[PDB]
Design a protein around this ligand. Structure first.
Ligand SMILES: *[C@@H]1O[C@H](CO)[C@@H](O[C@@H]2O[C@H](CO)[C@@H](O[C@H]3O[C@H](CO[C@H]4O[C@H](CO)[C@@H](O)[C@H](O[C@H]5O[C@H](CO)[C@@H](O)[C@H](O)[C@@H]5O[C@H]5O[C@H](CO)[C@@H](O)[C@H](O)[C@@H]5O)[C@@H]4O)[C@@H](O)[C@H](O)[C@@H]3O)[C@H](O)[C@H]2NC(C)=O)[C@H](O)[C@H]1NC(C)=O
Ligand SMILES: *[C@@H]1O[C@H](CO)[C@@H](O[C@@H]2O[C@H](CO)[C@@H](O[C@H]3O[C@H](CO)[C@@H](O)[C@H](O)[C@@H]3O)[C@H](O)[C@H]2NC(C)=O)[C@H](O)[C@H]1NC(C)=O
Ligand SMILES: CCOC(=O)Cn1c(C)cc(=O)n2cc(-c3ccc(Cl)cc3)nc12
Ligand SMILES: [Ca+2]
Ligand SMILES: [Cl-]
Ligand SMILES: [Cl-]
Ligand SMILES: [K+]
Ligand code: NA
Ligand SMILES: [Zn+2]
Ligand SMILES: [Zn+2]
Length: 783
């Protein structure tokens, strides 16, 4: 009855067992529900974890933690060094590396098991301490498939990243948006400590262990109560792998709290870090020795993966909100390496976030954080579409903390949580086994991509997630996913001169094809929603004009290394010309811009780069026009006039695709018409929330962008369309002092832009679709 039951013959059972019965599984301690004898029967410790010479051929003592008796191999009970100490065998790490071309599994193994070896807080650069410190991990890394680093999700904390690993989802989608969270609909608080986190209402998406079970693939329990020592976790996985064919799981997970813990205490470059790193490598060696003893070391796929990195952060670098705000005791702050602010009393009517933000904006010249309303955060973070994410956010500068007041502040030297493009936040990925490539390095990738791959490694169909299935095919020897191009949903018109200048009264005054080959280098973008749009050709650019939103969905042009920048003549300053290809009812009008005292306009193709004086008149077409606040125009003009040509000079030409983005509900997805919330004054011209540019050139920078044979090179941005430059604390200075800094912060993946625009790029190339998918997930980080 309840606790008084026994774990005899049930240690680390994979049976689902619930109250009133007592449990003997991985997590029973965390639920305070183990049988009274779980500890003495299942957590055996006697004689340590390694065979000694005097133990070989012993008589089995069931009290020992692991065994060196003759029978132990057939029971899965051996210490992992048994054959080394007693049967003249070599440690796995001492064995020369050899390509595993196909799974070499014992009979009864239908497929290679997958083992996920997760390490908390393993900064990518720890890898550089090499075989001197971590010989087992180095053999995995050098013989298998490795990336130089893996990008975590924001915030770069444990619970958001490991649940992202398990689901393929951004935190805003799976719900674990922090290690601590307040849900205002539950009116409840999620914390690492305590019981609330065990409630299923917090956890969204479909994690890998559920996907597997629902598709008939058995998982071992991924989670381990903190009192189960690491050696016992390894022995338990190995004993599960010894199970009969009709019980043995196909996917396993080990977890280590190190080196996060020592990282927090000693900082990432403390000499104390060698010892946790050695201990982790020893655990890796115990696993691989155990797999060798099972004849499974050439049969199992092993993933060695971290959740985030670690930065130098000390008490001496703490910003205090009480230096900026008068009554900080009235707010609650999720503090440290990020900030989330809400009133201490939920729904307190006196809470004044616009006044708080004002007092936090550019108030010190060396200010070590920046306040954002969450819809203004860089889109690449994907950190806004969830009720658990406070409206007010603080992005904290690397190496610093933010706290409410000094009564809240030595004992720690490291921490993490920062912007997920910060180098110290990057973590590790190594794949080793029959399905991974041999001795292969792959570009860094994002942890959201791994759920699709683990599904591939298991024969599973992934639940809908934020990975791009196929962008990681290059990690794998086989079991690749064959991606298929999405189908165009709306086809374009190619209008000619259906009209004449007399048919147009839009209030606009002006004082005065084979383009596809040169300007549309990778095919036209496919439109993947139902809409109405026209292709418009020009000497210097091409565009896909939308009759519904009154502006191009995309504008595409190529700029050579040698092109010239030219001014706008003073008589063409206010020139806008009707487009005689496009109806008057499907055009913007300049009257609305004359009436709207806060809105101005800009051009997607820049007049500054037209090839000839004649060609420049195309740039002033009403169909090249987009609404832009004067504040944004300070950025956009500097981009068009200075930076595009600088990029062409540096990359040997560049192809540019630019356009608008509408995301008023900040969910990272293309708005439907009903969701657009702002229009030019007294008109129906919608106002974009962001503008994008995709800048492509030849990876081989010695070939011009327009004559490129092989792989491509891409960088992109999604700039916020804002009525002020408050985000840029140096914006009073010249644009050369702050615009590029702004753009670097809003770097983006082509894939981000695709979600936000409903468009599909790079459909016509001499490259495999898999390579293209990789290109679309690339993020240029400028670190
Ligand atoms: C990243 O990938 C994810 C997954 O593909 C994308 O998220 C999906 O987005 C679509 C489009 O809006 C949305 O579509 C349908 O939503 C509802 C049906 O919702 C219910 O059923 C589904 C199916 O089981 C379930 O996944 C949903 O879970 C969500 O809601 C619960 C309860 O609040 C949460 O516990 C859970 O964490 C999910 O929350 C996320 O999604 C909701 C939106 O549904 C957000 O409000 C929330 O803050 C959080 O972001 C739910 O139980 C249907 O009525 C509607 O008409 C659509 O057909 C999916 O629901 C959504 N799925 C998930 C898992 O988020 C996401 O767009 C991708 N991001 C980018 C940038 O590409
Ligand atoms: C934003 O920062 C403001 C400071 O830059 C801060 O203003 C300060 O608020 C207090 C009380 O609201 C003022 O009043 C106290 O001092 C003056 C004498 O100078 C008296 O007139 C008052 O009765 C009272 O004694 C401070 O003067 C004022 N400081 C300044 C420089 O104006 C705001 O409170 C901050 N806002 C938020 C939302 O935190
Ligand atoms: C899911 C929110 O974060 C954790 O639960 C952290 N964690 C802790 C504290 C103990 C533990 O044993 N595990 C194991 C995993 C895990 C995560 C993903 C995958 Cl794919 C495989 C394993 N994560 C944990
Ligand atoms: Ca949207
Ligand atoms: Cl957090
Ligand atoms: Cl909280
Ligand atoms: K105006
Ligand atoms: Na400013
Ligand atoms: Zn962690
Ligand atoms: Zn940590």
């Amino acid at each position: 009855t309840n606790t008084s039951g026994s774990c005899k013959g049930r240690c680390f059972e994979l049976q689902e067992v619930g109250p009133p019965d007592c449990r003997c599984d991985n997590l029973c301690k965390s639920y305070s529900s183990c049988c009274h004898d779980f500890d003495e029967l299942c957590l055996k410790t006697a004689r340590g974890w390694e065979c000694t010479k005097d133990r070989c051929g012993e008589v089995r003592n069931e009290e020992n933690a692991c065994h060196c008796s003759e029978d132990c191999l057939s029971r899965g009970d051996c210490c992992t060094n048994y054959q080394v100490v007693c049967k003249g065998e070599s440690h796995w790490v001492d064995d020369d590396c050899e390509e595993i071309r196909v799974p070499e599994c014992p009979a009864g193994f239908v497929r290679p098991p997958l083992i996920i070896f997760s390490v908390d807080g393993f900064r990518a650069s720890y890898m550089k301490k090499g075989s001197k410190v971590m010989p087992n991990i180095e053999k995995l890394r050098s013989c298998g498939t490795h990336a130089p680093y893996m990008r975590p999700v924001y915030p770069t904390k444990t619970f958001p990243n490991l649940y992202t690993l398990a689901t393929g989802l951004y935190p805003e989608s799976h719900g674990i948006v922090g290690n601590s969270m307040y849900d205002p609909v539950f009116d409840a608080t999620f914390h690492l400590r305590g019981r609330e986190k065990f409630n299923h209402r917090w956890w969204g998406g479909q994690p890998l262990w559920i996907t597997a079970t629902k598709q008939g693939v058995r998982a071992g329990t991924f989670f381990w109560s903190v009192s189960i020592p690491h050696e016992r976790r390894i022995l338990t996985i190995l004993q599960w792998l010894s199970l009969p064919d009709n019980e043995r799981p196909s996917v396993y997970a080990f977890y280590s709290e190190q080196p996060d813990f020592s990282g927090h205490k000693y900082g990432p470059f403390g000499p104390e870090m060698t010892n946790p790193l050695r201990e982790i490598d020893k655990t890796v060696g115990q696993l691989m020795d155990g797999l060798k003893q099972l004849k499974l070391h050439r049969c199992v796929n092993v993933i060695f993966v971290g959740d985030h990195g670690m930065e130098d952060v000390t008490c001496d670098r703490t910003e205090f909100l009480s230096n900026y705000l008068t009554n900080v005791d009235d707010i609650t702050l999720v503090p440290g390496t990020l900030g989330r602010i809400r009133p201490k009393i939920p729904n307190n009517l006196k809470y004044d976030p616009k006044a708080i933000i004002a007092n936090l904006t550019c108030k010190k010249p060396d200010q070590h954080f920046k306040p954002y309303m969450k819809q203004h955060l860089p889109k690449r973070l994907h950190y806004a579409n969830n009720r658990r994410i406070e409206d007010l956010h603080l992005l904290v500068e690397r190496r610093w903390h933010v706290a409410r007041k000094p009564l809240d502040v030595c004992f720690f030297q490291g921490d993490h949580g920062f912007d997920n493009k910060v180098n110290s936040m990057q973590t590790v990925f190594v794949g080793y086994g029959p399905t991974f490539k041999y001795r292969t390095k792959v570009p860094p990738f994002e942890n959201i991509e791994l759920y699709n791959v683990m599904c591939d490694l298991l024969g599973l169909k992934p639940a809908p997630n934020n990975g791009t299935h196929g962008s990681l095919n290059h990690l794998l020897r086989t079991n690749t996913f064959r991606p298929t191009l999405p189908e165009e949903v709306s086809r374009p018109n190619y209008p000619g001169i259906m009209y004449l200048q007399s048919d147009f009264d839009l209030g606009c005054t002006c004082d005065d094809g084979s383009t596809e080959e040169r300007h549309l280098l990778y095919g036209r973008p496919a439109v993947l929603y139902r809409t109405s749009y026209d292709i418009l050709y020009h000497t210097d650019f091409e565009s896909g004009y939308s009759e519904i939103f009154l502006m191009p969905l995309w504008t595409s042009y190529t700029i050579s290394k040698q092109a010239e920048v030219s001014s706008i003549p003073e008589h063409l300053t206010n020139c806008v010309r009707p487009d005689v290809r496009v109806s008057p009812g499907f055009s913007q009008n300049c009257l609305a811009y004359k009436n709207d005292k806060q809105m101005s306009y800009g051009f997607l193709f820049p007049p500054y780069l037209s090839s000839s004086p004649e060609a420049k008149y195309d740039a002033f077409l009403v169909t090249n026009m987009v609404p832009m606040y004067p504040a944004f125009k300070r950025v956009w003009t500097y981009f068009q006039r200075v930076l595009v040509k600088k990029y062409a000079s540096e990359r040997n030409g560049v192809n540019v695709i630019s356009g608008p983005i509408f995301d008023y509900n900040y969910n990272g997805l293309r708005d439907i018409e009903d969701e657009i919330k702002q229009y030019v004054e007294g008109s129906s011209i919608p106002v974009p929330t962001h503008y994008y540019s995709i800048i492509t050139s030849c990876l081989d920078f010695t070939q011009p962008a327009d004559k490129c044979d092989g792989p491509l090179s891409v960088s992109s941005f999604i700039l916020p369309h804002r009525p002020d430059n408050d985000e840029s604390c140096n914006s009073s200075e010249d644009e050369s002092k702050w615009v590029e800094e702004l753009m670097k912060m809003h770097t983006a993946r082509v894939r981000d832009i695709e979600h936000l625009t409903g468009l599909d790029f790079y459909r016509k190339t001499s490259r495999s679709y898999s390579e293209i998918l990789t290109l679309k997930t690339y993020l240029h980080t400028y670190e």
